[PDB]
């Protein structure tokens, strides 16, 4: 708190990774105050804290709407909205630290070369912020040996919407996962090299064989949904981006990176490690409660979009400029409060569709790996629990429309 980060401090942070909204740097200096810690720094596209409608939508959380900055905002969103839903056991909202404009600029330039080219094209750190978040580095087993192998999972959405507000033209959405569909669109725009083999419904099934099936699939095609770290260094997956298919070569390096930690012989350490991850995922049941919060998206976007316009007090352009008689009347007949509720719960779900899980292993919650004769303690943590902006409802609808439209045309080539 009393700590204010300056330009010299910037030499003491290395590139860890990034998503779309934040840059994350690992500590690599000496100070006893930041050892075993990571820093989360908000980005701005190339191209005050809450909008008027946002202040309205979130009125039920007074602490949240009076947040002096977007760093406090996130902190309070986790603490006062996501925790009551997820539980505090595996959730850390982090600690604020005052930062200088110069620190931000120097760290911005420092890491540039370690960033993916397309990431740099789209956004850099927001240097107008006077704040950042310090978090426990989850690739270290606990604060204050030996080796720690850490696994990050981005599960995405693990259920299927029902047809009440999905017209027959988009019927596939009720039988094919958003994840599997987005794949084709992404491949088309060259945002990935191949289609994933990961099915989120498998991971969320609560069935052990299907959870192990998902892990194997996540190993084969990690993309941006699977990362492995050895004592804080990336040994599988992409750095701030999606990575391609696991080649025999990435297979060798990772298998060999596992000696010391997993005791097998020889090229079977991978198999047993996947088993390990799979056993920790199922046995902790940490996914079940995440699914419950994803299911707060009760109506799908094709439903919720209508409530969105009532909330912003705007003549619905979907019901207008579409066929009358196909105007979604039941939704618009709702009391304001129900409409506000539905869209609030839609945003929260979107947080849960887009967050990540980090699992920390060390040799001795535990897993008894039979095929190696080892025992591993684990720790589970939810990360990347960002507040989604209200105005994004419109782009969600447009992206969704684009997803199913592209997927239909591809399927129609029968
Ligand atoms: O930038 P990417 O790695 O491709 O991932 C993005 C990104 O997620 P993260 O930033 O959490 O990594 C978006 O989030 P923003 O940073 O833009 O907030 C998120 O968008 P929403 O969470 O708002 O949906 C989107 O998710 P989706 O594509 O399901 O909308 C998701 O894309 P992928 O997970 O598909 O890569
Ligand atoms: N507390 C943490 N410990 C270890 N790694 C982290 C932590 N927070 C983030 N990361 C890593 O940094 C990356 C980006 O973090 P994230 O919060 O997902 O950024 P964004 O908000 O842009 O999506 C993640 O993919 C994750 O691997
Ligand atoms: Mg995010
Ligand atoms: Zn409408």
Helix H or strand E segment including 216: helix 208-220
Do 133 and 208 fall within a single domain? no
List strands edge to edge, sheet with 233-236. 233-236, 226-230, 149-153, 356-363, 374-383, 366-369
| Helix ranges, 259-324 (H) | 269-284, 286-294, 301-311
Residue 284 burial (C-beta neighbours within 10 Å; 0-12, 13-18, 19+):
middle
| Peptide bond between residue 66 and the one before it cis (omega within 30 degrees of 0) | no
Place of tokens 């684009």: 402
Environment class of residue 118 by beta-carbon count within 10 Å: exposed (0-12), middle (13-18) or buried (19+)? exposed
Q: Coil, strand, or helix at residue 235?
A: strand
Question: Are both 172 and 308 inside the same structural domain?
Answer: yes
| Integer Cα distance of 216 and 232 in angstroms | 22
Same domain as 176, residue 116: no
Note whether 73 and 94 are within 8 A (CB): no
CATH of the domain at 37: 3.30.200.110
Q: Compute the distance between CA of residue 207 and CA of residue 328 in angstroms, rounded to an integer.
A: 37
Do 163 and 125 fall within a single domain?
A: no
The domain boundary residue, chosen from 146, 168, 203: 146
**CA geometry: angle at 289 spanning 39 and 83, to 5°?**
45
388 is known to lie in a ligand binding site: yes
Q: What is the DSSP string of 63-75?
A: HHHT-SSHHHHHH
Q: Dihedral of CA 218/220/223/227: which sign?
A: positive
126/151 same-domain check: no
Give the resolution in Å. 2.4
Residues 49 and 194 in one domain: no
The token duo for 351 is: 């947080």
Domain boundary at 113, 146, 179, which? 146
State whether 126 and 178 are in the same domain.
no
Whether 399 and 372 map to the same domain: the answer is yes
> 173 CB contacts (<8 Å, ≥6 apart)?
160, 161, 166, 181, 300, 404
State yes or no: 227 annotated in a binding site. Answer: yes
Q: Give the helix/strand (H/E) hosting 366.
A: strand 366-369
According to DSSP, residue 243 is labeled B
Scanning 112-207, the segments in alpha helix (DSSP H) are: 117-122, 178-188, 200-204
- 373 with 282, same domain: the answer is yes
Provide CB contacts within 8 A for 103, sequence distance 6+: 5, 6, 7, 9, 10
Query: Ligand 2 pocket, 17 CB below 6 A?
Result: yes
Would you call 365 helix, strand, or coil by DSSP?
Answer: coil
Helices (H), ranges, 68-207:
70-77, 83-86, 101-111, 117-122, 178-188, 200-204
**Which range of residues forms the domain containing residue 355?**
147-414
* Spatial CB neighbours of 323, under 8 Å, sequence gap ≥ 6: none
Q: Which of 37, 356, 379, 387 to mutate to test the pocket of ligand 2 (most atoms within 8 A of CB)?
A: 356
Q: What's the gap in Å between 139 CA and the centre of ligand 2?
A: 11
Cα 321 from Cα 387, distance rounded (Å): 31
How many domains would you assign to the chain? 2
Q: Please tell me whether residue 21 adopts helix, strand or coil conformation.
A: coil
Residue with CA at minimum distance from ligand 1 atom 27:
354
Answer yes or no: are the C-beta atoms of 41 and 25 closer than 8 Å: yes
Pick from 146, 171, 186: which residue ends a domain?
Answer: 146
Q: Solved how? A: X-ray
CB contact at 8 A, 339 and 307? yes
- Same structural domain for residues 30 and 108? yes
Q: Is 154 annotated as a binding residue?
A: yes
Measured in degrees and rounded to the nearest 5, phi and psi for residue 221 equal -130, 80
The dihedral through the CA atoms of 248, 251, 252, 253 has a sign that is positive
d(CA 370, CA 373): 5
């Amino acid at each position: 708190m009393e700590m204010i980060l300056e330009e010299k401090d910037a030499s003491d942070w290395i590139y860890r990774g990034e998503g779309g909204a934040n840059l994350v740097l690992a500590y690599a200096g000496s100070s006893p105050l930041f050892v075993g810690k990571v820093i989360r720094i908000q980005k701005a596209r190339r191209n005050s804290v809450l909008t008027s409608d946002e202040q309205h939508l979130w009125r039920e959380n007074n602490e949240l709407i009076s947040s002096p900055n977007k760093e406090v905002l996130e902190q309070r969103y986790v603490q006062n909205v996501i925790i009551p839903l997820l539980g505090p056991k595996h959730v850390d909202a982090g600690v604020r630290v005052s930062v200088s404009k110069e620190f931000l600029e120097c760290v911005d330039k420092k890491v540039t070369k370690q960033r993916p080219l397309w990431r740099v094209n789209a956004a850099n750190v927001d240097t107008s912020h006077d704040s950042a978040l310090i978090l426990n580095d989850h690739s270290l087993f606990s604060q204050g040996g030996g080796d720690c192998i850490s696994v990050e999972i981005k599960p995405k959405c693990g259920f299927l919407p029902t047809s009440r507000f999905i017209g027959k033209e988009n019927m596939l959405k009720t039988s094919v996962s958003r994840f599997k569909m987005h794949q084709l669109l992404k491949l088309e725009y060259i945002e990935i090299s191949e289609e994933s083999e990961y099915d989120p419904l498998d991971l969320f099934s609560g069935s052990k064989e299907r959870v192990l099936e998902a892990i194997k699939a996540l190993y084969s095609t990690p993309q941006n949904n699977f990362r492995v770290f050895l004592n804080g260094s990336l040994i599988l997956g992409g750095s701030g981006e999606s990575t391609g298919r696991t080649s025999p070569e990435i297979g060798y390096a990772f298998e060999d990176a596992l000696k010391g930690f997993i005791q097998s012989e020889d090229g079977h350490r991978t198999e047993c490690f996947l088993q390990l991850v799979s056993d920790a995922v199922y046995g902790s049941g940490v996914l079940d409660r995440l699914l419950e919060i994803q299911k707060l998206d009760k109506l799908d976007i094709e439903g919720a979009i209508h409530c969105y316009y009532d909330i912003i007090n705007q003549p619905c352009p979907i019901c207008r400029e579409g066929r009358p008689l196909e105007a979604e009347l039941s939704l618009h007949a709702l009391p304001l409060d129900e409409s506000l509720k539905i869209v609030k719960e839609y945003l929260i779900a979107a947080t849960a569709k887009d967050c990540s899980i980090m699992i920390s292993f060390q040799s001795r919650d535990y897993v008894s790996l039979k095929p190696t004769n080892q025992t591993f303690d684990y720790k589970v943590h939810f990360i990347d629990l960002s507040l989604k902006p209200l105005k994004r409802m419109e782009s969600y609808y447009k992206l969704d429309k684009k997803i199913i439209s592209f997927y239909n045309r591809k399927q129609k080539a029968e």
